[PDB]
Amino acid sequence: RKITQGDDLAPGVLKIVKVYLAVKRRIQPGDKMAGRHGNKGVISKINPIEDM
């Protein structure tokens, strides 16, 4: 009964509802990268292993 607990939601609200999302924000271009020594910048293409 911290789950089955209720709380007032002020005069104007009988009930409230929620959902949470595990958003798998994958590796992609336009996203940002860096290293420890102050190099900071955008991922500007993904290259085949030989395109390198």
């Binding site: 009988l14 009930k15 509802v17 949470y20 595990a22």
Partner: protein, 51 residues
């Protein structure tokens, strides 16, 4: 370098003259596949993918 996130979204049912407000899935002929994933109370299941 894939990252993982946890984020939150919410809704309400206001104090009406009776007291409750509605929560269900009826949105007919507007995007039906974006409805297929829900509880009796109009809510997604823990463990389901959504996009």
């Amino acid at each position: 370098f894939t990252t993982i996130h946890i984020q939150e979204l919410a809704c309400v049912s206001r104090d009406t003259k009776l007291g409750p407000e509605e929560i269900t899935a009826d949105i007919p002929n507007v995007g039906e596949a974006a409805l297929s994933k829900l509880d009796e109370s109009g809510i997604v299941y823990i463990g389901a993918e959504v996009t």
